[PDB]
Design a protein around this ligand. Structure first.
Ligand SMILES: NC(=O)c1ccc[n+]([C@@H]2O[C@H](COP(=O)([O-])OP(=O)(O)OC[C@H]3O[C@@H](n4cnc5c(N)ncnc54)[C@H](OP(=O)(O)O)[C@@H]3O)[C@@H](O)[C@H]2O)c1
Ligand SMILES: NC(=O)c1ccc[n+]([C@@H]2O[C@H](COP(=O)([O-])OP(=O)(O)OC[C@H]3O[C@@H](n4cnc5c(N)ncnc54)[C@H](OP(=O)(O)O)[C@@H]3O)[C@@H](O)[C@H]2O)c1
Ligand SMILES: N[C@@H](Cc1ccc(O)cc1)C(=O)O
Ligand SMILES: N[C@@H](Cc1ccc(O)cc1)C(=O)O
Lengths: 249, 253
């Protein structure tokens, strides 16, 4: 049982909180917007003031804010007020950025665990089993607390993948970022089902619908803060152009 | 007497009203600028992200719970021709001449208008609404049954029921609640602290400060910008403080 504080209690913060509560951990939260009533509903304590959140009795701080805002959020936190050395976990969709920034900004005696649960409310509605949880033990000295946190995902059946933040971003730029870009592009075309949909087109409509559920902040953070994304955007754009020219001749 | 109620603006006060409406057995729908999907799931409310879908739902009464400052933009963005049926619009803004004038100008003629201000909220009616004041003005009512069923929501909670014009409301609110918030905001800027030797009077001021600082600055701003009688009351406050101050100087001398 862990005392887990969520920083950024939005869509994915709430998603993680439901399962950690179910396992019996003690959850608290803080966020830019006021989630007092939703935390009341869920049965957890919300701290309108980040300073009171950080002086509380807390084993793990999970950074669930948007990629775009992480630097501002960490910058606004009075981290010297931490009672104890504390494990910091990030769940951002890109990994080199939070690794670099937490190593730079956190107090040195705070541990760092960089993760990406490769799933969320769209793909893992009825549980985490067989979805991938990527993690990088960036700066761990309390292996007990870190293992307790990682076990949250192991006991839910996740496929557990240790890899560096760099290898994550290289792979994510080719897969997740391309998938979102295609979903977003179909969203601007506003593709719609017809009476003669093929199965392939049905999957694309569904892919469009699920990708459009993520914020534009999230999508844009995949591009801005993954140094490998720009070339994958080029690869996609160049390939489409080459396909077009085989048709145009 | 159980209603299909849609709430526009599911923020701090919209949620406050919904809690008691759910307790009474009403069926609630909500829409808002921000996404309250999860919280509405918890409370059993049907949440529409898009106001156009909101307006085609099965709604008896639409309750406008957006900030004073945003009412004009929110109503303006509503495709009001999407309305399935003539519908009662209720306003719960803390000032009243403004929504009354705007809804009479903007709403479809066939839609009824009840202009209200519950003189209480999360800070003062935390443990129930009993013997708090609920003000209302029947601006344009033709279906008396639905209007009466809505007003019943507050009467059954033990509210003090005050029928009064929107003008008379703003006249009284400029002299009272605006002054109260101004004093609380002034004490908040002074950041007054408790002391070894607090008197009871000072204790109530500290408490008043804390309660007044819990409302949004948008709200406090709306009390002044959209009440044509607030400006004179802010002058009367400064004028009174300076009158007291000068008598101290004369007493000093
Ligand atoms: N399935 C998923 O959605 C998923 C999966 C894996 C990882 N992630 C990652 O989890 C994190 C949150 O994802 P999300 O889906 O909830 O959507 P998101 O739009 O990326 O992030 C929303 C959260 O970021 C906060 N936020 C945004 N801008 C802020 C700013 N200037 N200042 C302070 N706080 C700000 C928001 O606070 P408020 O809510 O209080 O306004 C909210 O809590 C992201 O880093 C995402 O990359 C998401
Ligand atoms: N005790 C009270 O607080 C109390 C008592 C009586 C009457 N009232 C009145 O009830 C109404 C709500 O008050 P409140 O306490 O909840 O705080 P408020 O700050 O006055 O209003 C908050 C609501 O206004 C919405 N909003 C603000 N700016 C907006 C904009 N440009 N566009 C669209 N929506 C906007 C917000 O939408 P989102 O939440 O989706 O962001 C939120 O729902 C006010 O008119 C107030 O005068 C309040
Ligand atoms: N939100 C998607 C997955 C996802 C996870 C993280 C991301 O960064 C992006 C997408 C889902 O429900 O599975
Ligand atoms: N929000 C405070 C004060 C307040 C009352 C009425 C209002 O219209 C606005 C603010 C309360 O709980 O009472």
């Amino acid at each position: 049982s862990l005392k887990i504080g969520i920083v950024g209690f939005g869509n994915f913060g709430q998603f993680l909180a439901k399962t950690m509560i179910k396992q019996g951990h003690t959850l608290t939260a803080t966020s830019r917007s006021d989630y007092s009533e939703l935390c009341l509903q869920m049965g957890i304590h919300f701290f309108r003031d980040v300073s009171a959140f950080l002086t509380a009795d807390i084993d793990v701080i999970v950074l669930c804010t948007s990629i775009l805002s992480l630097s501002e959020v960490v910058g606004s936190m009075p981290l010297t007020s931490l009672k104890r050395p504390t494990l910091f976990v990030d769940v951002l969709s890109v990994k080199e950025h939070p690794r670099e920034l937490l190593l730079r900004e956190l107090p040195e005696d705070s541990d760092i665990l960089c993760t990406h649960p490769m799933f969320g409310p769209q793909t893992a509605k009825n549980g985490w089993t067989d979805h991938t949880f990527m993690y990088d033990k960036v700066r761990i000295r309390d292996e007990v607390i870190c293992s307790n946190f990682i076990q949250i995902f192991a006991t839910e059946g996740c496929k557990m993948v240790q890899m560096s933040c760099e290898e994550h971003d290289r792979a994510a730029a080719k897969s997740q970022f391309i998938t979102h870009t295609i979903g977003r592009t179909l969203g601007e075309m506003d593709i719609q089902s017809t009476p003669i949909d093929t199965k392939g087109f049905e999957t694309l409509v569904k892919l469009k619908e699920t990708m459009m559920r993520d914020s534009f902040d999230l999508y844009s953070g995949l591009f801005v803060y993954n140094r490998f994304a720009r070339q994958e955007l080029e690869n996609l754009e160049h390939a489409l152009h080459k396909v077009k020219e085989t048709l145009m001749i």
